[PDB]
């Protein structure tokens, strides 16, 4: 027919596809509006017609029925079919159903081949991630059972008032001179709880020695509701699964850490690291490795298919001077300094214009515009000239990128950014489509709920900071979820709207968006990347007993440092013991240094770096001793543990690897500093002096209304009473150094809440912040996070991994983070890993795979039975569960004994047999003990039965074997990390003790004692809540802290030191990043690939 020919001709024509794409984009723009005006209703038909028209065409050319090369045969045409039928259903007859219209956005993926291919590759990646997903579910369930057993109902502890019975009249309580109907109704009343200081949270409390303490007049009691609206708790197994999924993603995990330790006890912190350093880091890095290998296979398949005048120095110096001159800007500039800045900028732009004109005269426009850099310079100079005749100046900053001409690593960053929207732009487009789809889905589903039930989730009188009422805020929430903060807003979402639907939407966006982001990250990363005396001295130094003695002295001296608590002044004998011990260590180490000098001579001793370190430490000790016979030099004694680096080979080899990587690390650090200089200068221009708040101290610590107080001038003018304080946010953009600090907090994603809240309220220059005017400053931070964090971390990781690959290649292909003995044990483990394979009625029955499958089903059923445990369960439920446990123990005993009925070969045939034997023996031990927190441990011992699942699983077994193979390298890395934690905790004890308790620093997670400092350092090893700890350090003087305070040891107030605090926290954050992220990822990926 001719109709078929016409339909085919219109179908194949590119104009038709372009029309479909344009209408899809227009519909996407219309779906952004939260409140569609009535007239747009008419426009709806247009789309419904167009979507019909095109569909009709596809129906005419192809065949509706099923057959080769037909309409419904193509999977994506199902999208057209569903969209058209849904549109007709919604419009023809009678709504939340309209949210399904968002699926029309996916038509974009249909109208471009590149997006189809990208989605296909993503689907194969998801398919390959199946084993890791199963392992993650299994580990999360196991740790969730462990946490449920350990902390069942712990989070419901609260410091309630100490009630008194009214002479047992009717079981009533007369607390605080008020009678309540019953004890149960009294306890559930939140008017008698105790709020945590400076927070709107009920103080969790415990009765264990380590757990938190109830202030005088209060007592710990379990009655109440779980914290943060009751969505965090270990009471039910499913709640524990949610909490440990939160832990695994390290999402606001410091809050759960602090709550659990406050309620149960500090010792339980152990549990947390066993879930973080082996449950969170390990699982995420395993996912990283699996995705990377899948992408590598995809790239290999694609590759196989494809197969078959000296003035430049002057200009660069001028650019460097100009960028530095722009960096000479800050808050409260003097008039003369501002004039000097203006004159300098004017002369710089003048000279740049003159150079551009001269070198465009030398080569005419045809020649001049022949270079990309030349057109870039022309655009920059034109923009600067237009601005000369406000962020309009920031364009000039981009000139610094010219330094990429001969800077290879800045060129690598430029290549990364180019590939982001170049070769790999299709995947970026897919990510953008996903983000838009999820933003509109969330807004359409939750806009009315957020609007009409705002008071539920709005602590302030106005609307909440994060919501889905408007499209921009929905996109902001989706972006925040992508950045990793997916639960803090989820609690509000579930509180204001449906729990089930919000759970589903947020979990889906988390999983899918993080998958896409990780695919983009890995794709970019792979795409872009006397004589007798001397003899005696040598003999005495050479004895191994001498080395052991020196090691013992090093460790014991470090321990002696570990006692410098605030409580020494109370402990007298220990103080004098420590003084004598310190003198002894100084003397013995000096004696050892002299012996080494004599035995080996000055040249050999001073030609060894570690000898230099030991000599420096001893020199500091001697300087301190002679000064005593400098107070700022005493605290440098906290570097004593560094003597342990040279002795133990594990830390020595790890330090060798890190030193080898130092040059590349420094190159990338310089590139990152130059790149972040642009964003810090822009932030200084946008937000210099606009971060101040005229707070009223008496009425809390919240910014005043902009109507009553408008700016600093009015804040000082209304000073009849000394209540108003014009204070600036701790971390801000008043300078470029403060710019780097705030940018670091935004990039690491800790403490960015306050920075963005202060930015998106910046009303003017030192003017009082309005609630949320100047809103679109949000974009600023978003942009930064796209470049300053995503691409910057990509460069970090790529360069460091490339450096480690070069180091491995140089070292004969062997490992980098292992010793000789560890290498031999690793070889033995590898050999053991791939070992080759080696009454009649029962022998024939048990050996059958059906028996193993039945045992597997039985153990799965037992796991399900343990999932049912819950706090405050009725006694009959307890009895039934105990009986079921006894039955399961009996069944396992029966199966093990019938297996034993075979010859003794099974007694040693495999290691899993002995594991089964020992777990059964423990099971009977626990059951017999039941006839007699020890009970909690006995119950927790039952989790060993679940591990029997490992036998059947293949992917689980391989991944766990990879972890076991990686264990020694991780042991070395963790040893070095623990040494660094020890040193930094001693520094904190020396400095940060006595600081005012605010934000992260509370009565339990202080820096006062070694225990508390170690807890804080452990939590901020993952960079979690380091802004919280840093905040109390920064504040100096009123109204925050009170200097001139009678402190125990150092009576110079309770204020922190901003300079040393910032240095301490930034250096520790960077060191911990390096080690735990880069090295741990390197080990995980290497041992997974080899495994
Ligand atoms: C081949 C061998 C290579 C490995 C050895 C090289 C690495 C060793 C490290 C050198 C960096 C140490 C620099 C010392 C900084 C101390 C400055 C200082 O004394 O001030 C103090 C600074 O304290 C701080 O918080 C800064 C924290 C800096 C930590 C440096 C220690 C890092 C230890 C880990 C080494 C690196 C990782 C392991 C080795 C790769 C404050 O006291 P105050 O000012 O006197 O207070 C006044 C009233 N109390
Ligand atoms: C996860 C991270 C990925 C890797 C990071 C890549 C490198 C990006 C780095 C950024 C370094 C951070 C620099 C922070 C500078 C802090 C400046 C600041 O706080 O404000 C200034 C005052 O405070 C001070 O910092 C003065 C003391 C100087 C501290 C020096 C900090 C050294 C930087 C840490 C080391 C950098 C990393 C290198 C590691 C080997 C001025 O502002 P103000 O409003 O006038 O207040 C006056 C009160 N004194
Ligand atoms: C990736 C792709 C597609 C994910 C969407 C899966 C289809 C969702 C259909 C089930 C569903 O969402 O219904 C929800 C029912 O809640 C459930 O039972 C969750 C069922 C999830 C089963 C597995 C979901 C797989 C997701 C993929 C919410 O509806 P509602 O409870 O009536 O809401 C009342 C208003 N407060
Ligand atoms: C108001 C009530 C407050 C009373 C204070 C109660 C404190 C009781 C608790 C102490 C728990 C600390 C146990 C941590 C053990 C792990 C650290 C450790 O043992 O390392 C060693 C340090 O061991 C210690 O910290 C023992 C000293 C305990 C600190 C508390 C002092 C006792 C105070 C209460 C009596 C040193 O290793 P290294 O030489 O640095 O080697 C580095 C690389 N290998
Ligand atoms: C705690 C972190 C250790 C992670 C668990 C290590 C599990 C090792 C594993 O099951 O891998 C398999 C090894 O299986 C075995 O023969 C050992 C059987 C013992 C299973 C129970 C292990 C309990 C783990 C806690 C004790 C740590 C053991 C460390 C061993 C050096 C790989 O064998 P494959 O699949 O035939 O080779 C391919
Ligand atoms: C009886 C009252 C208290 C209401 C009942 C609420 C529970 C039935 C809900 C509350 C929150 C829900 C949890 C919220 C979060 C998760 C995380 C989610 O994690 C994953 O999806 C992991 C995916 C992966 O491993 O990649 C699995 C469902 C789960 C446990 C949900 C299971 C059901 C829970 C516990
Ligand atoms: C009356 C009050 C407000 C005076 C306080 C002003 C200072 C806080 C300003 C004046 C000089 C400024 C500095 C001028 C020059 C630089 C160079 C600039 O150099 C870099 O580019 C470092 C990073 C790199 O090497 O790329 C970093 C910011 C800094 C230290 C500036 C930080 C803020 C400073 C110290
Ligand atoms: C009190 C009422 C209002 C709420 C009761 C909670 C239920 C509605 C919870 C119980 C288990 C929850 C489900 C548990 C797990 C998921 C997995 C989640 O999907 C993933 O986690 C992605 C997995 C992957 O693709 O790898 C989507 C939400 C969903 C279906 C949850 C939806 C909500 C459910 C059904
Ligand atoms: C700073 C002050 C002294 C410096 C040290 C001075 C001498 C050396 C010797 C140097 O050893 C050599 O590789 C050859 C030079 C030599 O040892 O004579 C290694 C760096 C190191 C430890 C330096 C590291 C940095 C230090 C501690
Ligand atoms: C208050 C008035 C002075 C302020 C000045 C004093 C110290 C200055 C800082 C000195 C050192 C740095 C380190 C610099 O970062 C690095 O040098 C990284 C390490 C490296 O160089 O590799 C960025 C500027 C900054 C924060 C400077 C910003 C401005 C500061 C805070
Ligand atoms: C109203 C009062 C009595 C509250 C009682 C609630 C409990 C009886 C609930 C809370 C947690 C629930 C469990 C949460 C999660 C699962 C996982 C679920 O896992 C599966 O085996 C199905 C998915 C799969 O493995 O393919 C089986 C049901 C079970 C044990 C649920 C059974 C019912 C439990 C124990
Ligand atoms: C009507 C009156 C008596 C109200 C009280 C009823 C309770 C005694 C019920 C409510 C929930 C029930 C539980 C719900 C779910 C399970 C899972 C079920 O799972 C299995 O373990 C199956 C395998 C097996 O046990 O053989 C075992 C019974 C048990 C614990 C039930 C035991 C009896 C419970 C505690
Ligand atoms: C108010 C008082 C009574 C509180 C006492 C609480 C302590 C019992 C807690 C707080 C600090 C905790 C420790 C902090 C740091 C570590 C390091 C961690 O790393 C290692 O030490 C492994 C290598 C080694 O064996 O040294 C092991 C757990 C441990 C000892 C923690 C165990 C429990 C501790 C000692
Ligand atoms: C990298 O993320 C993750 C890694 C591991 C487990 C979970 C993760 O969260 C998922 C997603 O990556 C969200 N990220 C965004 C950026 N990230 C910054 C960062 O790496 N901080 C950091 C530092 C400075 C030192 C040590 C360890 C870490 C994680 C924070 C979290
Ligand atoms: C000038 C000014 O605003 N002073 C306030 C006062 O109005 C307020 O009543 C008090 C706390 O209630 O804090 C202060
Ligand atoms: C912050 C915290 O958890 N507890 C403290 C408590 O130790 C202190 O005695 C009291 C005095 O204001 O303030 C609160
Ligand atoms: C407060 O409660 C505690 C709980 O044991 C009790 O010992 C005490 O007598 C009560 N009264 C106070 C602290 O004044
Ligand atoms: C006070 O602040 C709120 C939000 O910060 C704002 O909506 C209101 O207009 C301000 N003025 C008042 C309450 O008089
Ligand atoms: O400066 C005068 C006083 O008030 C202000 C504080 O920063 C301190 O300097 C002192 O307590
Ligand atoms: O907070 C520090 C304190 O120092 C000074 C006091 O007069 C208070 O007004 C102030 O709050």
Return the ligand 3 atom nearest residue 512 CA.
1
**Half-sphere exposure in the Cβ direction for 910 (13 Å, CA):** 11
Distance CA(385)–CA(357), nearest Å, equals 13
Between helices 1080-1090 and 955-991, what is the axis angle to 10°? 170
Distance CA(751)–CA(1031), nearest Å, equals 9
Kindly compute the dihedral angle of the four CA atoms of residues 511, 512, 513, 516, in this order, to the nearest 10 degrees: 120
- Helix, strand and coil content of the chain, in percent to the nearest 5, comes to 70, 0, 25
Distance CA(666)–CA(697), nearest Å, equals 45
**Of 364, 389, 302, whose CA–CA distance to 124 is shortest?**
302
- CA 325 to each of CA 333, 345, 402, 770: distance values in angstroms, whole numbers, following the listed order: 14, 8, 17, 33
If you ran DSSP here, which 8-state letter would residue 36 be given?
A: -
**Half-sphere exposure in the Cβ direction for 314 (13 Å, CA):** 7
Q: Determine which residue's CA is closest to atom 4 belonging to ligand 17.
A: 219
Buried b (16+ CB within 10 A) or exposed e, 709-719: bbbbebbeeee
Distance CA(475)–CA(443), nearest Å, equals 9
Residue 657's SS3 state is helix
Please state the φ and ψ torsions of residue 153, each to the nearest 5 degrees.
80, 5
Cis peptide preceding 1039, ω within 30 of 0: yes
Query: Quick check: 1016 and 1022 in contact, CB under 8 A?
Result: no
Identify residues after which the chain is interrupted (C–N over 2.5 A): 94, 308, 389, 529, 629, 838, 932
Provide CB contacts within 8 A for 867, sequence distance 6+: 141, 145, 237
Beta pairing partners, 725: 695
DSSP H/E element including 891: helix 875-900
Query: Quick check: 797 and 525 in contact, CB under 8 A?
Result: yes
If you ran DSSP here, which 8-state letter would residue 468 be given?
A: S
Pocket flag, ligand 17, residue 215 (CB < 6 Å): no
Measure CA 437 to chain center.
25
DSSP H/E element including 547: helix 544-561
Closest ligand to 951 CA? 5
Report the first-to-last Cα separation within the chain, whole angstroms.
Answer: 61
Pocket flag, ligand 7, residue 334 (CB < 6 Å): no
Q: Which residue has the tokens 């107080």?
A: 709
Distance CA(137)–CA(67), nearest Å, equals 40
Query: Quick check: 1007 and 1064 in contact, CB under 8 A?
Result: no
**Of 1008, 1083, 999, whose CA–CA distance to 254 is shortest?**
999
Return the ligand 1 atom nearest residue 609 CA.
1
Distance CA(168)–CA(898), nearest Å, equals 60
Please state the φ and ψ torsions of residue 378, each to the nearest 5 degrees.
-60, -45
Query: Quick check: 164 and 175 in contact, CB under 8 A?
Result: yes
Provide CB contacts within 8 A for 66, sequence distance 6+: 72, 73
Torsional class of 601: left (φ above 0), alpha (ψ -120 to 50), beta (otherwise) = left
Measure CA 318 to chain center.
40
Distance 868 CA to ligand 11 centre (A): 7
Query: Quick check: 1003 and 997 in contact, CB under 8 A?
Result: yes
Closest ligand to 719 CA? 15
- CA 388 to each of CA 208, 384, 671, 688, 783: distance values in angstroms, whole numbers, following the listed order: 68, 6, 29, 21, 26
Between helices 38-61 and 14-31, what is the axis angle to 10°? 150
Kindly compute the dihedral angle of the four CA atoms of residues 281, 285, 287, 293, in this order, to the nearest 10 degrees: -170
Residue 776's SS3 state is coil
Residue 724's SS3 state is strand
- CA 16 to each of CA 29, 47, 227, 301: distance values in angstroms, whole numbers, following the listed order: 20, 15, 57, 33
**Of 201, 176, 304, whose CA–CA distance to 258 is shortest?**
201
Provide CB contacts within 8 A for 743, sequence distance 6+: 676, 679, 680, 683, 784, 788
- CA 503 to each of CA 269, 507, 734, 1007: distance values in angstroms, whole numbers, following the listed order: 28, 6, 41, 38
**Of 642, 667, 977, whose CA–CA distance to 817 is shortest?**
977
Distance CA(182)–CA(640), nearest Å, equals 60
**Of 153, 172, 164, whose CA–CA distance to 222 is shortest?**
153
DSSP H/E element including 349: helix 335-362
- CA 44 to each of CA 77, 91, 101, 301, 471: distance values in angstroms, whole numbers, following the listed order: 21, 9, 11, 44, 19
Q: What DSSP string runs through 559-597?
A: HHHTT--TTTTT--HHHHHHHHHHHHHHHHHHHHHHHHH
Mutate to test the pocket of ligand 2, among 741, 800, 1021 (most ligand atoms within 8 A of CB): 741
Distance CA(534)–CA(828), nearest Å, equals 43
Q: Which residue has the tokens 């490339």?
A: 802
Residue 194 tokens read as: 């105790």
Distance CA(446)–CA(723), nearest Å, equals 41
**Of 777, 762, 902, 908, whose CA–CA distance to 846 is shortest?**
902
Distance CA(1089)–CA(293), nearest Å, equals 8
Q: Determine which residue's CA is closest to atom 6 belonging to ligand 10.
A: 737
Provide CB contacts within 8 A for 91, sequence distance 6+: 44, 45, 48
Please state the φ and ψ torsions of residue 700, each to the nearest 5 degrees.
75, -160
Residue 939's SS3 state is helix
**Of 333, 1062, 396, 1071, whose CA–CA distance to 738 is shortest?**
1062
Largest pairwise CA distance in the chain: 113
- CA 70 to each of CA 63, 77, 112, 120: distance values in angstroms, whole numbers, following the listed order: 5, 10, 19, 20
Distance CA(1072)–CA(976), nearest Å, equals 10
Mutate to test the pocket of ligand 3, among 79, 449, 498, 501 (most ligand atoms within 8 A of CB): 501
Number of H helices, E strands in the chain: 47, 4
Query: Quick check: 285 and 970 in contact, CB under 8 A?
Result: no
Distance CA(757)–CA(742), nearest Å, equals 13
Q: What DSSP string runs through 1034-1048?
A: H--STTT--SS---S
Please state the φ and ψ torsions of residue 727, each to the nearest 5 degrees.
-115, 145
Q: Which residue has the tokens 């626990």?
A: 926
Pocket flag, ligand 20, residue 1039 (CB < 6 Å): yes
Pocket flag, ligand 18, residue 757 (CB < 6 Å): no
**CA gyration radius, the chain:** 34
Distance CA(660)–CA(1079), nearest Å, equals 13
Distance CA(575)–CA(334), nearest Å, equals 53
Distance CA(545)–CA(543), nearest Å, equals 5
Please state the φ and ψ torsions of residue 1046, each to the nearest 5 degrees.
-70, 75
Residue 1028's SS3 state is helix
Distance CA(803)–CA(293), nearest Å, equals 19
Query: Quick check: 781 and 758 in contact, CB under 8 A?
Result: no
If you ran DSSP here, which 8-state letter would residue 792 be given?
A: H
Distance CA(525)–CA(292), nearest Å, equals 9
Query: Quick check: 248 and 140 in contact, CB under 8 A?
Result: yes
Query: Quick check: 569 and 1048 in contact, CB under 8 A?
Result: yes
């Amino acid at each position: 027919h001719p109709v078929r020919r016409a339909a085919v001709k219109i179908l194949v024509h590119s104009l038709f596809s372009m029309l479909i794409m344009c209408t899809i984009l227009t519909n996407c723009v219309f779906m952004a509006q939260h409140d569609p005006p009535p007239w747009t209703k008419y426009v709806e038909y247009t789309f419904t017609a167009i979507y019909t028209f095109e569909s009709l065409v596809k129906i005419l050319a192809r065949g509706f029925c099923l057959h080769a090369f037909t309409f419904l045969r193509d999977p994506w045409n199902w999208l057209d079919f569903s969209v058209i039928v849904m549109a007709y259903t919604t419009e023809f007859v009678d709504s939340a159903l309209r949210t399904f219209r968002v699926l029309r956005a996916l038509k974009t993926i249909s109208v471009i081949s590149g997006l189809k291919t990208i989605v296909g590759a993503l689907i194969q990646s998801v398919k390959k991630l199946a084993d890791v997903m199963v392992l993650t579910v299994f580990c999360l369930s196991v740790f969730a059972l462990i946490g449920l057993q350990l902390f069942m109902g712990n989070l419901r502890h609260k410091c309630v008032r100490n009630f008194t019975e009214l002479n047992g009249t009717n079981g009533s309580v007369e607390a605080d001179g008020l009678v309540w109907n019953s004890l149960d109704v009294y306890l559930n009343d939140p008017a008698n709880y105790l709020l945590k200081n400076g927070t709107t949270d009920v103080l969790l409390c415990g009765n264990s020695s380590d757990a938190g303490t109830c202030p005088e007049g209060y007592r710990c009691l379990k009655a109440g509701q779980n914290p943060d609206h009751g969505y965090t708790s270990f009471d039910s197994f499913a709640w524990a699964f949610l909490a440990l999924f939160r832990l695994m993603t390290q999402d606001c995990w410091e809050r759960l850490y602090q709550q659990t330790l406050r309620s149960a006890g500090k010792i339980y912190m152990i549990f947390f690291m066993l879930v973080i350093f082996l449950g969170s880091f390990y699982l995420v890095n395993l996912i990283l490795a699996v995705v990377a290998m899948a992408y590598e296979e995809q790239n290999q398949a694609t590759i196989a298919e494809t197969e078959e005048p000296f003035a430049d120095l002057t200009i660069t110096m001028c650019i460097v001077l100009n960028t530095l001159f722009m960096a000479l800007e800050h808050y409260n500039m003097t008039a003369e300094f501002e004039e000097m800045l203006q004159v300098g900028n004017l002369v710089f732009t003048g000279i740049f214009t003159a150079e551009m004109t001269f070198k465009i005269i030398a080569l005419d426009p045809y020649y001049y515009f022949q270079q990309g850099w030349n057109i870039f310079d022309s655009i920059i100079v034109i923009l600067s000239l237009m601005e000369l005749g406000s962020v309009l100046r920031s364009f000039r900053l981009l000139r610094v990128f010219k330094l990429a001409k001969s800077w290879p690593t800045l060129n690598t960053l430029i290549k990364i950014i180019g590939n982001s929207v170049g070769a790999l732009g299709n995947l970026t487009l897919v990510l953008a489509i996903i983000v838009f789809i999820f933003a509109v889905v969330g807004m359409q589903l939750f806009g009315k709920n957020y609007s009409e039930l705002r008071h539920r989730i709005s602590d302030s009188g106005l609307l909440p900071r994060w919501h889905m009422m408007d499209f921009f805020h929905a996109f902001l929430i989706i972006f925040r979820i992508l950045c990793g903060e997916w639960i803090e807003t989820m609690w509000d979402c579930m509180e204001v709207s449906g729990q089930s639907l919000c759970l589903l939407v947020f979990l889906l966006v988390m999983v899918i968006g993080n998958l896409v982001v990780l695919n983009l990250f890995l794709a970019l990363l792979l795409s872009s990347f006397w004589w007798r005396l001397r003899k005696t001295c040598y003999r005495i130094v050479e004895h191994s007993w001498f080395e052991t003695f020196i090691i013992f002295m090093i460790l014991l001296s470090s321990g002696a440092l570990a006692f410098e608590d605030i409580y020494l002044e109370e402990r007298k004998t220990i103080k004098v013991l420590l003084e004598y011990a310190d003198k002894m260590f100084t003397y013995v180490f000096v004696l050892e240094m002299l012996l080494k000098w004599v035995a080996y001579g000055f040249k050999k001793y001073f030609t060894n770096a570690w000898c230099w370190l030991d000599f420096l430490i001893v020199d500091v000790s001697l300087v301190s001793l002679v000064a005593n016979t400098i107070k700022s030099l005493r605290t440098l004694r906290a570097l004593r543990p560094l003597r342990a680096l040279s002795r133990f080979e594990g830390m020595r080899v790890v330090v060798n690897a890190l030193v080898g990587a130092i040059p590349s690390i420094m190159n990338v650090l310089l590139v990152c500093l130059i790149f972040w200089l642009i964003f810090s200068i822009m932030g200084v221009n946008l937000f210099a002096g606009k971060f101040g708040r005229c707070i009223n101290q008496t009425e809390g610590d919240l910014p005043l209304n902009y109507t009553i107080v408008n700016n600093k001038s009015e804040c000082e003018s209304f000073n009849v009473t000394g209540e108003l304080y014009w204070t600036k946010v701790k971390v801000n953009f008043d300078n470029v150094g403060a710019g780097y600090l705030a940018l670091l907090q935004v990039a690491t994603f800790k403490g960015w809440m306050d920075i963005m809240y202060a930015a998106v309220d910046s009303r003017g220059y030192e003017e009082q912040p309005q609630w949320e005017d100047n809103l679109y400053m949000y974009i600023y931070f978003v942009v930064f996070i796209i470049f300053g964090s995503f691409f910057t971390l990509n460069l970090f990781i790529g360069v460091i991994i490339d450096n480690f690959n070069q180091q491995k290649k140089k070292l004969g292909g062997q490992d980098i983070f292992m010793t000789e003995e560890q290498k031999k044990y690793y070889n033995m483990m590898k050999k053991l890993g791939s070992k080759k394979p080696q009454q009649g009625f029962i022998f024939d029955i048990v050996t059958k795979q059906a028996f193993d499958v039945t045992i597997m089903f039985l153990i799965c059923l037992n796991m399900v039975t343990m999932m049912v445990e819950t706090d405050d369960q009725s006694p009959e439920k307890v009895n039934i569960l105990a009986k079921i446990n006894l039955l399961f123990v009996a069944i396992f005993t029966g199966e093990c004994i019938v297996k034993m009925a075979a010859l003794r070969h099974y007694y040693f045939t495999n290691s899993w047999n002995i594991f089964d034997f020992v777990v059964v023996i423990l099971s009977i031990v626990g059951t017999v003990l039941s006839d007699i927190t020890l009970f909690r441990v006995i119950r927790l011992a039952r989790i060993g039965r679940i591990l029997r699942l490992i036998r059947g699983a293949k992917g689980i077994r391989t991944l766990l074997f990879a972890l076991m193979m990686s264990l020694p390298a991780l042991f070395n890395i963790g040893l070095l990390l623990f040494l660094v934690m020890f040193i930094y905790s001693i520094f904190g004890m020396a400095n940060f003790a006595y600081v005012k308790w605010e934000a992260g620093i509370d009565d339990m997670f202080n820096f006062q004692t070694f225990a508390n400092s170690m807890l804080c350092l452990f939590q901020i090893t993952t960079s979690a809540g380091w802004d919280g700890l840093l905040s109390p350090i920064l504040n100096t003087g009123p109204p925050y802290c009170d200097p001139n305070l009678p402190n125990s040891n150092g009576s110079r107030g309770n204020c922190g030191s901003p300079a040393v605090g910032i240095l301490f926290f930034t250096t520790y954050i960077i060191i911990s990043f390096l080690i735990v992220v880069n090295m741990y990822i390197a080990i995980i990926l290497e041992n997974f690939s080899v495994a």
